[PDB]
Design a protein around this ligand. Structure first.
Ligand code: L9Q
Ligand code: LMT
Length: 732
């Protein structure tokens, strides 16, 4: 199968370069417009009750646009807000930007619009010392994405009022700053990561052309991957986070895939094979290894589709499209480029000891295999102790804390929450709905409200139980159906969300009406629950599919079960350190972030990426161990030769993916630091502790058992065209 494709990619080398590059280049220009068709929601279980409570509530009471923008206005020269001359100056500036942007702004609302008023909440829009006052600027739009795109049209002119002294906070100033970290992370990779991976590529090949090919394949991969997702956006929504994942993960392992193809090609050239025979032996070995490695990551990402979070679904599609296009380009464009170029892939040089490290790998493995229990036992018990911090796992939602504490937009929100306490609330909603269609009586409301007061832990700023669980305000865009009435109240502690939500759902609603418990604490706790309910079924599918794929890439049954254990150990040890640094705070003062509960759908993603990544690096290693073993060599020889003919490649393939990960660990977005650190930690763990010690030690204990497989299972692999674990007699 790969032997057949090895020679066909040489006979049609000119057209597979022309056609496949054209598709990858066509998707690039078609993918430039991808940033204009992305959404920000998908963190909640869309088929849950808290979401239903939000759909019903917005349909009846209307969407709330009061929290879109809150602008803190401060008069210069210590003037008080009662300065009539200053009020006239800023109101005209506000009336001016609304006049110029009627299509983006509904209007502005606040104490300035009525300085002499008797409304308490409007009079609370000013501080007791008359030095600050805030306004609400509701924005136009039918969904949260159109609203945010309207705030970004007016923010510069809005920021210029009051001599520039205006603090913008609320839902949209933060969302602009959160989604803006994406571009900050891309530009940081284009000026700091892609130059670093250029000098890493040159120190493995010594010539510019051999080093430039994996980068070209990686560029063609993301170019064609951004085009695939732009086509996906024509049918279903896609999230903003799916663009960095293509750069953070797809661009990294695509260069890794293109690395084993070019290295194996130069290896066959030095052995004395001609250009056609070389590209066929790489496809039978590295090309086969890369295809298996790509399908494994796919098998690591599809179980996330069991999870109902659309944020996850959009990301799996980006991982699938990036790793598969990478493998396809590796055995098409790259394999044919090596066929056209040939040994003048080593021609140019930098002007335009490789055998001594390969011996150091042999010496280290012989030390490991000589006293293996002295290496396996201390390593695996240390990794188990690194899983202990995972017991302190807490889960939360998005807030202004996802930015560094020195972020101006975050500070403007925190300044609002201390000058004007009471306006910012996260209430749990009791959405009452009658199936009669008849109005809900005032007694039905006071009855459901009386049951909500039997549940402690709810906010009471007035110090009166009669003022608790008020009705939600009715905006002028909602159909005031008296069949549906909702009452809401916030919590004294967010940590009581899961507890108090269950206490509200346990209340017996009035005879005819049915109650839906919603609010952002309910939305968060329902996405948490949906992940950890299908997390075991996800892990079951994740493990059995990756294991059988390695049984085909290799020829053994115990080797895939070994790697699964070494991948589970690397997983738990990596997530325990992350819980130790992003939840408990160890490393927050240096990396500039605040420890806080994690986004629950993000632990599902980090499980998928780390697993498929650690398995891929096991496939890169053992593929040469089995290939040497298939030549009749002993187990200790197959091990040594395995981790010596690839000990430099796997080392180099890890630094590249670590550099691009090291560029996202500086992201102002904290959950990107969590993801990029997870790749950085697991990469170092796999490429050093696992590869150099735990793999040779455990395989030495097993001996010839390492390669064993039942016979009725080896012929199946053989039957499919996947039994090319060993090469043919060739003369060169
Ligand atoms: C009128 C009917 C009221 C409805 C019930 C009250 C609801 C909450 C009202 C209190 C205001 C604060 C609500 C924050 C809740 C939104 C959380 C959320 O969506 O969740 C958001 C993130 O939440 C936040 O970032 C909170 C930031 C600040 C929120 C509050 C601002 C305070 C301003 C208060 C001014 C109001 C006073 C004006 C009255 C004067 C007349 C995530 O989402 P997503 O999945 O898409 O992507 C993630 C991208 N954000
Ligand atoms: C390959 C890996 C396979 C791993 C298999 C994992 C199986 C499932 C693990 C436990 C499942 C239960 O999931 C449980 O959800 C509740 C929801 O409150 C979490 O509760 C935790 O988070 C929520 C939200 O902050 C709150 O309860 C509180 O922060 C904390 O107690 C528990 O921490 C978690 O244990």
């Amino acid at each position: 199968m790969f032997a057949w494709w090895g020679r066909t990619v040489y006979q049609f080398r000119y057209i597979v370069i022309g056609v496949m590059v054209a598709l990858c280049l066509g998707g690039g220009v078609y993918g430039i417009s991808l940033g204009n068709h992305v959404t920000q929601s998908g963190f909640y279980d869309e088929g849950s009750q808290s979401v239903a409570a939000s759909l019903i509530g917005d349909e009846v009471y209307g969407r709330d646009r009061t929290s879109h923008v809150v602008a803190i206005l401060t008069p210069p020269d210590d003037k008080k807000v009662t300065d009539k001359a200053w009020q006239k100056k800023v109101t005209e500036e506000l009336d001016q930007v609304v006049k110029d942007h009627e299509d983006q702004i509904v209007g502005w609302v606040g104490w300035l619009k009525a300085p002499d008023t008797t409304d308490p909440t409007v009079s609370a829009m000013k501080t007791q010392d008359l030095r600050h006052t805030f306004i609400s600027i509701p924005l136009q739009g039918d969904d949260d994405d159109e609203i945010l795109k309207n705030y970004q049209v007016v923010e510069p002119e809005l920021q210029q009022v009051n001599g520039g002294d205006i603090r913008l906070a609320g839902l949209n100033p933060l969302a602009s700053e959160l989604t803006g970290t994406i571009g900050e992370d891309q530009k940081r990779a284009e000026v700091a990561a892609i130059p670093l991976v250029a000098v890493v590529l040159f120190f493995v090949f010594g010539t510019v052309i051999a080093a430039a090919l994996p980068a070209i394949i990686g560029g063609l991969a993301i170019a064609g991957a951004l085009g695939i997702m732009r086509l996906v956006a024509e049918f279903t929504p896609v999230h903003f986070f799916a663009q960095p994942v293509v750069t953070l993960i797809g661009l990294g392992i695509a260069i890794d895939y293109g690395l084993f193809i070019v290295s194996r090609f130069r290896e066959e050239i030095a052995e004395g094979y001609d250009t056609e025979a070389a590209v066929r032996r790489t496809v039978m070995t590295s090309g086969r290894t890369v295809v298996f490695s790509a399908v494994i990551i796919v098998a690591s990402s599809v179980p996330l589709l069991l999870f109902p979070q659309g944020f996850l679904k959009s990301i799996t599609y980006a991982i699938i499209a990036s790793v598969m296009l990478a493998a396809i380009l590796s055995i098409t464009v790259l394999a044919a480029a090596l066929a056209i170029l040939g040994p003048r892939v080593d021609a140019l040089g930098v002007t335009t000891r490789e055998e001594v490290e390969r011996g150091f790998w042999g010496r280290l493995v012989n030390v490991v295999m000589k006293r293996p229990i002295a290496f396996a036992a201390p390593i695996l018990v240390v990794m188990v102790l690194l899983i202990i911090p995972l017991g302190q796992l807490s889960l939360g939602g998005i807030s202004e804390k996802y930015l560094p504490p020195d972020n101006a937009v975050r500070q403007s929100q925190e300044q609002f929450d201390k000058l004007f306490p009471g306006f910012r609330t996260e209430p749990l909603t009791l959405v009452m709905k009658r199936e009669d269609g008849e109005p809900i009586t005032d007694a039905q409301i006071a009855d459901m409200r009386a049951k909500a007061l039997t549940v402690s832990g709810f906010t009471d700023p007035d110090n009166d139980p009669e003022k608790m669980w008020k009705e939600r305000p009715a905006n002028d865009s909602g159909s005031k159906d008296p069949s549906v009435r909702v009452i809401q109240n916030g919590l004294e502690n967010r940590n009581d969300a899961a507890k108090k939500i269950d206490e509200l759902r346990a209340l017996q609603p009035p005879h005819g009406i049915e109650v839906f418990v919603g609010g952002t604490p309910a939305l968060e706790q329902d996405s948490i629950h949906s992940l950890f309910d299908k997390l075991p079924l996800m892990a079951l599918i994740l493990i059995v599919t990756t294991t059988v794929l390695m049984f085909l890439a290799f020829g053994s049954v115990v080797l895939p079960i070994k790697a699964a254990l070494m991948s589970a150990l690397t997983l738990g040890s990596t997530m325990g350190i992350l819980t130790w640094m992003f939840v408990d705070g160890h490393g927050s003062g240096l990396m500039n972030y605040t420890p806080q509960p994690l986004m629950a759908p993000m632990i599902g993603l980090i499980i998928a990426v780390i697993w498929g990544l650690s398995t891929d690096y096991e496939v890169f290693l053992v593929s040469r161990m089995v290939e040497a073993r298939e030549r009749g060599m002993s187990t200790a020889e197959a091990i040594r030769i395995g981790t010596a003919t690839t000990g430099r490649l796997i080392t180099g393939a890890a630094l590249i993916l670590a550099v691009v990960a090291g560029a996202f660990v500086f992201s102002d977005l904290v959950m990107m630091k969590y993801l990029a650190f997870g790749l950085l930690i697991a990469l170092l763990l796999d490429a050093t502790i696992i590869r150099m010690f735990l793999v040779p030690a455990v395989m030495k204990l097993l001996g010839d058992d390492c390669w064993w497989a039942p016979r009725w299972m080896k012929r199946v692999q053989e039957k499919l065209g996947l039994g090319e674990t060993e090469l043919p007699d060739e003369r060169k």
